[PDB]
Design a protein around this nucleic acid. Sequence first.
RNA 1: ACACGGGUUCAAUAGGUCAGACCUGGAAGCUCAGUAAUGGGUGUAGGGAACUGGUGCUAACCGGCCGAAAACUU
RNA 2: GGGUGGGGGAGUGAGAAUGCAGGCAUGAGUAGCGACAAGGCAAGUGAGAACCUUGCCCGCCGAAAGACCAAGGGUUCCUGGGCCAGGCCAGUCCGCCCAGGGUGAGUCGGGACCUAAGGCGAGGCCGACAGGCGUAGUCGAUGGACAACGGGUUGAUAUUC
RNA 3: GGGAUGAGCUGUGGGUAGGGGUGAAAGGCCAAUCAAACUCCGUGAUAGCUGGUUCUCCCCGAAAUGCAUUUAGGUGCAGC
RNA 4: GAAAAGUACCCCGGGAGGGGAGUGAAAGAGUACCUGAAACCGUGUGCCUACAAUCCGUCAGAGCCUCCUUUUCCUCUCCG
RNA 5: AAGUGUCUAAGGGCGCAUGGUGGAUGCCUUGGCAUCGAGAGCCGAUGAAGGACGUGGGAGGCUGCGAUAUGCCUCGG
Lengths: 53, 42, 116, 113
Amino acid sequence: AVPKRRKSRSNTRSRRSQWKAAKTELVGVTVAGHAHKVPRRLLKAARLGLIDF
Amino acid sequence: GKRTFQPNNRRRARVHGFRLRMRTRAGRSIVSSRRRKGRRTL
Amino acid sequence: PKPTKGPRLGGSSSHQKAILANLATSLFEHGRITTTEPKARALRPYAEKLITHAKKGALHNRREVLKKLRDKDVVHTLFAEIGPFFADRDGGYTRIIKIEARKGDNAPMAVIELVR
Amino acid sequence: EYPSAVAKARFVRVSPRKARRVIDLVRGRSVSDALDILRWAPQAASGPVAKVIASAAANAQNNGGLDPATLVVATVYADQGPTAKRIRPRAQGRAFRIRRRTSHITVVVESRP
RNA sequence: ACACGGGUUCAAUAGGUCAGACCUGGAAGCUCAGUAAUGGGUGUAGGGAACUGGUGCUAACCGGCCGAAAACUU
RNA sequence: GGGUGGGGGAGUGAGAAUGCAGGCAUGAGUAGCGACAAGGCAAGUGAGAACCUUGCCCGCCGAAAGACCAAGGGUUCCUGGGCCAGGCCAGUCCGCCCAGGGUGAGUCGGGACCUAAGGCGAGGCCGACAGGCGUAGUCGAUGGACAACGGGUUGAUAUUC
RNA sequence: GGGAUGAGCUGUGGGUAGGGGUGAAAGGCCAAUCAAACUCCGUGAUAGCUGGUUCUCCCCGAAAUGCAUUUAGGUGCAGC
RNA sequence: GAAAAGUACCCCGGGAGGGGAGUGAAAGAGUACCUGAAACCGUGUGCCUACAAUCCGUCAGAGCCUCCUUUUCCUCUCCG
RNA sequence: AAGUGUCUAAGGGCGCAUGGUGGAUGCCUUGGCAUCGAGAGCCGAUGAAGGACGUGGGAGGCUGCGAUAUGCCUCGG
């Protein structure tokens, strides 16, 4: 079926705003160089070395 | 079977080619028409 | 290895078999192998079982490892060096590490390693 | 009030909604905190956004004579750009349009300790 | 999807490893019989996924976040 | 470039015609991303790599998903660069863009041979004119004579060098 | 699934053309819409039918009846 | 743009793109360029909104923010 | 004990400020349409009109030209 009517910009915007993006960072991680803020997921390959950047 | 339009230089020319348009009077008329309109005629 | 629920890797189960045997071939080649994390999650038990046979070390273990890895020579190395290298560890032969997700599909990549 | 640097990427071929879903992740956050956030954001519009946040911090340093370790992103826009309507042919000879929307990222950084 | 529940080194949470319950059905090799097909021995073998219990080997990683202080009356 | 005063003159006023053109919204970051052949692993280049190159696995076709010709296309061929457009994603690559190069015949296939169906058709009959039909004849291969084979070569041509 | 040495399939080249072609006939096909193709022209056809007709105010302000009608959803005359 | 004087030079970038510089009277004229409408898309900011229906307005209307201000006022009015 | 008392903003609306999209309005113009006036009123087998193919130092297009090919000779300005 088709949209019977167009959306009142209220509803449109109200769930364009539920199109978020996630987050996590683990600041202050000493590696070769100056402490990089790799995410908590990856910090084992941050330590060991198996991470670009 | 499943066929649409079959290209050919021989049939294209032997029908919608100049040397056949000028082979009559309605075709001389048609080349005249397209030369009036200013095309790149045929 | 218990099976996997859900859609098997690659395509169907046959391609999952082939994927696993290939990943284990190159794991017992280089030791350090990058895949996407679900491939490594499927391969860690599978590879650890193969290496259990490796540190067993007998023609029946060779003949039950050659029923996974076709290659005679990577398995020569399995039952030559990788096998005895685990003279101590009872279980725990491989190790997963997290790499950054592959650009182009954001596929969570992981490097699986023979422990040393 | 402040010595606030500026920068703007124009005609980045990244659609502004996809670009703003990443913009909303540095809204008022330290400049290098924001760069260190957009390096790990998978949202794959982090390319342009991080490039121009770093460009703005660089402009601060090199043209406004400021120090990196104080900046903080004050404004980030993702203005519309042109759209370059491609044609996609679909089922039963009906020919549908495909907008090539592009954006203008716009950064303004400040200095406030 | 999210959620929910369990666990995070004082760990049995997943994995591996060991001993099981079970599934299959009698491994490979060697040996002996047989013209041979094949059959007996080593030998409930051998293989093995979920079920059970062990065991600190692998992964839970020397974390990031968000979070109170009440305006007061009979 | 316009005021305002007296006048002349209007393609003079839009909210509708499933109106017309341009732009831009809602659906919506949603469907889809074009077959039930299957991919990866190491290395490289690179700003950037699931897709590009080298390898090695692994797999699918193999009366075709291989190798050739005819038409058809018309440079898509090869070398070099490019990645501001397209490739249903990305691309460092590309049948894309740009430059430049590349197609060699006595024998291959056609015309310098022949003709069938059929076309045209000197004179010609018929038609009111337009035209129609046609003889001699000249075209018309899809067919009939006709002289080259084996191998080597380049980035791209081969019974051609 | 039917046919599959045949009333077979297919290639090349050619012929038949719009009240005409062709049709083992269905009014089927004649370049993706054939009870008469498509295009340019008559042409801006035409419709008693449908839709649309754009700025302001001040005053006045109906009708949906009569008669006739190839006429009854139109119109002419009257009435208002 | 009157004239190309079309942004030398450094800076971020792999490029596009920008920042500063400079040209120009104007960059609020940058080879996406005279003026730059509206739809449309954002950023910020004052109000309101998570017990509540209501062609989405209108009227009555508390409050909250607004600039503006007369003064109790401070008599530093010899400057708000 | 009983009673009262807003603060919230995931996000919406409204208004302002600041932008972007787009290209309307204004003002043009290397373009048309419409007439008036004076001509001229045909070209071609001595090959027309209309073109293909080429021609420039270098790509193409338009234009000029034609293997003598943005040209050749004389007369003039």
